[PDB]
Design a binder for this molecule. Structure first.
Ligand SMILES: Nc1ncnc2c1ncn2[C@@H]1O[C@H](COP(=O)(O)OP(=O)(O)O)[C@@H](O)[C@H]1O
Ligand SMILES: Nc1ncnc2c1ncn2[C@@H]1O[C@H](COP(=O)(O)OP(=O)(O)O)[C@@H](O)[C@H]1O
Ligand code: SF4
Ligand SMILES: [Mg+2]
Ligand SMILES: [Mg+2]
Lengths: 273, 271
């Protein structure tokens, strides 16, 4: 089973990319996929489960209690029987925002939920801080491969670079490696050239350019991924291609993070605003 | 002294808004201002100071040690003697990203850095999570009043709403209140209407609309806030007006955060 962690800044397209890739892997490549939501926003599985928001493991522990919760309560099946979990986490202000990810991954390991017949487990992880439960997939090697979603914006590549510092720290301990940067386009000029240079500099590749396409919001309105909603659309084919390149990827690196000065110089070099 | 925490999503304009407001309070309103950076990005003070970040308290503790650090090492004076500190934070992957904020605020309280003659202390706080040292200014009441920077974008309003849940939690314990949402415009149609509706619904106000203006990047290139670079520019006068509304603000609320469904429905309404 390939254990894959998807990191990136808030709003960059982690859950859009993960869900669409998961649906494309199942539909176009006949793969068994599990999605484990590790983002307090807790909408990482909504489009696979056709719009019904799933109860988080933390909310169930809170209401029904530890020794009365079964795999069937926490794991729901959606499009093509893709298995879905939401870690959840405590209320803003209360304790560590990542604590639910620890409890959730611990329980899935305890209960053998990550079965040997899975082709892929995706952890959709909040990446604005790399600490607590948000770091666990990298620190404890729950995922062996990382892809970072970014775009042509300073804060997106700053977040990417920061996540890469996490990977450097835990590379020898955990065996975790960077598989690539996914460009989730924000439709800005220089974006592709910028990320080609960024990825070369940190020692990886931009594995795929995902276009910004209105079909994503049309599919969201119909409570679906693009592959489920309209598998003949170009955007479905883009996720099918991203899915292919992830299946076939053999380039896993310890990245070489940049200084703040190098990030700022590379932004002005490609006229990213 | 008014103790003010500025929260918001990464990249929303917390440090641009804080530094320009601080410069406008000093220049237009003759105020003594202290800025305490509580964001690991650690560039919260670059435009008040000469440029290229100041050393963080955490990096100095790491290299020279506590008990060999003086106030003068951590607090730098910039435009109109605005005093500046960067908390810093551990390396990504190493411990809690907020732990430096706690150490830094504790040390400034220890060493009496927040002198009674200060009109304003601004905490520039990472708002993508509200936990550990990022929650401390609200949980332990180091700031009494909060402004949230947002824009038309879904994740900016999601972050605002989530920060409001933090404020609700600590409202009775700490006496923390929300003073308003600052719209730092991303130059999109519907933005003003979106934030008017969002702020009414959660029981606050959009205190000020900060236009997207190229003068900010011209001033950054000159290593300056807009007030320092060009105080006669409209954008300098906008920060002077935001500064005025903060000085005169008497509307401090416990907000009523939206549910997931309410927030999602209102985001698709103003897409
Ligand atoms: N490639 C894309 N084209 C169109 N809309 C997109 C695309 N990627 C993301 N979106 C939109 O961007 C927003 C944020 O994406 P999301 O996947 O939730 O981000 P994250 O999980 O990183 O916070 C959503 O409104 C989603 O529809
Ligand atoms: N009102 C504005 N007009 C133009 N550019 C702005 C404005 N506010 C912020 N910016 C730009 O947006 C970027 C991010 O702002 P910043 O203050 O660093 O965000 P944060 O502190 O929330 O991470 C900077 O490059 C800054 O120049
Ligand atoms: S470890 Fe990270 S997520 Fe947890 S309290 Fe600290 S900043 Fe928040
Ligand atoms: Mg998400
Ligand atoms: Mg900042």
């Amino acid at each position: 089973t390939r254990k894959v962690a998807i990191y990136g800044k808030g709003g960059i397209g982690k859950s859009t990319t993960t869900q669409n890739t998961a649906a494309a892997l199942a539909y176009f490549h006949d793969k068994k996929v599990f999605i484990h939501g590790c983002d307090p926003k807790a909408d990482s599985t909504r489009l696979i489960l056709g719009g019904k928001p799933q109860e988080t493991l933390m909310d169930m522990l809170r209401d029904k209690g530890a020794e009365k919760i079964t795999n069937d309560d926490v794991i729901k099946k959606g499009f093509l029987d893709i298995q879905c979990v939401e870690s959840g986490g405590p209320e803003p202000g209360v304790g560590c925002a990542g604590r639910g990810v620890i409890t959730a991954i611990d329980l899935m390991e305890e209960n053998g939920a990550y079965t040997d017949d899975l082709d892929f487990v995706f952890f959709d992880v909040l990446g604005d801080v790399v600490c607590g439960g948000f770091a666990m997939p990298i620190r404890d090697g729950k995922a062996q491969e990382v892809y970072i979603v970014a775009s042509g914006e300073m804060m997106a590549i700053y977040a990417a670079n920061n996540i890469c510092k996490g990977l450097v720290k835990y590379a020898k301990q955990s065996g975790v490696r960077l598989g690539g940067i996914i460009c989730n386009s924000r439709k800005v000029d220089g974006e592709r050239e910028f990320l080609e240079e960024f990825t070369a500099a940190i020692g990886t590749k931009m594995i795929h350019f995902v276009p910004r396409d209105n079909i994503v919001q049309k599919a969201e309105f119909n409570k679906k991924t693009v592959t489920e909603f309209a598998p003949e659309e170009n955007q479905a084919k883009e996720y099918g291609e991203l899915a292919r390149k992830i299946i076939e990827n053999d380039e896993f690196v310890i990245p070489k993070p940049l200084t703040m000065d190098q990030l700022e110089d590379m932004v002005v070099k490609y006229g990213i605003a």
